[PDB]
Amino acid sequence: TIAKDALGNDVIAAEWLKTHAPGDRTLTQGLKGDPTYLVVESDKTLATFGINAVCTHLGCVVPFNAAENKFICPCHGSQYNNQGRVVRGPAPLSLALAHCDVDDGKVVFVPWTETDFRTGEAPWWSA
Numbered sequence: 006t007i008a009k010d011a012l013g014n015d016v017i018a019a020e021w022l023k024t025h026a027p028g029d030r031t032l033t034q035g036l037k038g039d040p041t042y043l044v045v046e047s048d049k050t051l052a053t054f055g056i057n058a059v060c061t062h063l064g065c066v067v068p069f070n071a072a073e074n075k076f077i078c079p080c081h082g083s084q085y086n087n088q089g090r091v092v093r094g095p096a097p098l099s100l101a102l103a104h105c106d107v108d109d110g111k112v113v114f115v116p117w118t119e120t121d122f123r124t125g126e127a128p129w130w131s132a
């Protein structure tokens with residue numbers, strides 16, 4: 006699915022990288038409309054995966070805390086590292102992933118069913 010920014014515009018990779026500083030984590034509309042983080046890597050390239058921002062506890066949207074490099078849920082305090090791996094409950098699972106690719110200049114999110122690269126476990130979201 007083509008990623009859309011907060012204003013409803015398709016995310017055009019080359020343009021996104023001009024206005025989003027390296028290390029940036031900004032929410033976009035991802036698979037099934039779920040808020041998904043598009044991340045600009047250290048070397049000024051888009052990360053190859055998107056992080057679904059829907060908390061695994063009750064579904065609040067988790068913001069990124071740049072100071073601590075953690076996504077911290079304002080609803081009940083669940084914490085996740087910078088790759089979305091769960092670090093503190095009540096959420097029992099890591100934030101879901103999506104593959105991030107570019108098609109005809111547009112950023113597209115695609116389902117992630119391969120091994121959860123963060124732990125070696127099968128993705129819990131793809132069954």
Ligand code: FES
Pocket residue numbers: 060061062063064065078079080081082083094095096
């Ligand atoms: S909805 Fe995220 S801590 Fe409960």
